[PDB]
Design a protein around this nucleic acid. Structure first.
Ligand SMILES: [Cl-]
Ligand SMILES: [Cl-]
Ligand SMILES: [Mg+2]
Ligand code: NA
Ligand code: NA
Ligand code: NA
Length: 326
DNA sequence: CCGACGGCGCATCAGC
DNA sequence: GCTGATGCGCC
DNA sequence: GTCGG
């Protein structure tokens, strides 16, 4: 972290634009600049030096010059002092409360943790659980715990049906020493792009993880995506482990590589890679890579037998998961 | 200048 | 009920 | 806010 000061500044700006301004492209612009600066292997001496990086323009260069000169950004100083902006930013830290709901709550005079707690009746289910575990959800997960969580999930899935394959993706697969949550990609031979030969494939897995008290709450759940909460078991007399967020995504088995590419991320890496695909005449999602016809309409799925096949199509050298932490 | 900016699952709501 | 928009989430 | 044409 040679440039932690700058990247933190840009992240704060991004969060302001997302949460308060509701300007999603400005949010993406700031995070893209933070990410490109984050991997730049020199301690940045000036805005002009930064502007040479893709994603960094005149405005960010100017902000970087102010930040280097003074150690701060007046624009952010003012944002931090602003009660409404501060309140809105706080509320969005609850899972299920986004920029729109946060601003609505603040309009109603709900703007602190205490306010939320006494107004549970005003929260949807997702928001209710996000509040319940507010503190827990902001803690990181040590890789050692991620390994214990992996062992439980893979073993319980095996107990349901030996043909399931569960793969922990997200920051974990990129080799992170700590993760924000647990992401599990799931496949089963009965669910392919050609057919669904068994119903409840995701449900049966969630059910089993609930039965053993690993999954403790549900934020949302459909045929192919579960979003919930889980907890490691603790030993006699041991303090409990924090509750953790868990996402499970069931992907057609024949679309595993696009699926695991997607779910491995990072999010910015995916945006960068998908944008590069477009420039190359392809579109990539978690299922397929397809060509763009002249009209600019997606064609048929291209054959994919490896993650690397996808990089090849868009003329990128392969990048190992550990090198996708953008 | 100016359009594009990644792609999509689930929850919720408006309109019919 | 449905469909389509929108909010919020995931990487 | 930044880029590409
Ligand atoms: Cl915007
Ligand atoms: Cl597709
Ligand atoms: Mg994750
Ligand atoms: Na630049
Ligand atoms: Na939130
Ligand atoms: Na996740």
């Amino acid at each position: 972290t040679l440039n932690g000061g700058i990247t933190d500044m840009l992240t704060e700006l991004a969060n302001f634009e997302k949460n308060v301004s509701q300007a999603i492209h400005k949010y993406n612009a700031y995070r893209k600049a933070a990410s490109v600066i984050a991997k730049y292997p020199h301690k940045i001496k000036s805005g002009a030096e930064a502007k040479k990086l893709p994603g960094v323009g005149t405005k960010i260069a100017e902000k970087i010059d102010e930040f280097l000169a003074t150690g701060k950004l007046r624009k952010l100083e003012k944002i931090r002092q602003d009660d409404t902006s501060s309140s809105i930013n706080f509320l969005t830290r609850v899972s299920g409360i986004g920029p729109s709901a946060a601003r609505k709550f603040v309009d109603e005079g709900i703007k602190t943790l205490e306010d939320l707690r006494k107004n549970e009746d005003k929260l949807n289910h997702h928001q209710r659980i996000g509040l319940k575990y507010f503190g827990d959800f902001e803690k990181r997960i040590p890789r050692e715990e991620m390994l214990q969580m992996q062992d439980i999930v893979l073993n319980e899935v095996k107990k349901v049906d030996s043909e399931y394959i569960a793969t922990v993706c997200g920051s974990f697969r990129r080799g992170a020493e700590s993760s924000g949550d647990m992401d599990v990609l799931l496949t089963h031979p009965s669910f392919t792009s050609e057919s669904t030969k068994q119903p409840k494939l995701l449900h049966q897995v969630v059910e089993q993880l609930q039965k053993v008290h690993f999954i403790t709450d549900t934020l949302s759940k459909g045929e192919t995506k579960f979003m919930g909460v889980c907890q490691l078991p603790s030993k006699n007399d041991e303090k409990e482990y924090p509750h953790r967020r868990i996402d499970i995504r069931l992907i057609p088995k024949d679309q595993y590589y696009c699926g695991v590419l997607y779910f491995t991320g990072s999010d910015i890496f995916n945006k960068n890679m998908r944008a590069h695909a477009l420039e190359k005449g392809f579109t990539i999602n978690e299922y397929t890579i397809r060509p763009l016809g002249v009209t600019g309409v997606a064609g048929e799925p291209l054959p994919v037998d490896s993650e690397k096949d996808i990089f090849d199509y868009i003329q990128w050298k392969y990048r190992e998961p550990k090198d996708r932490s953008e």
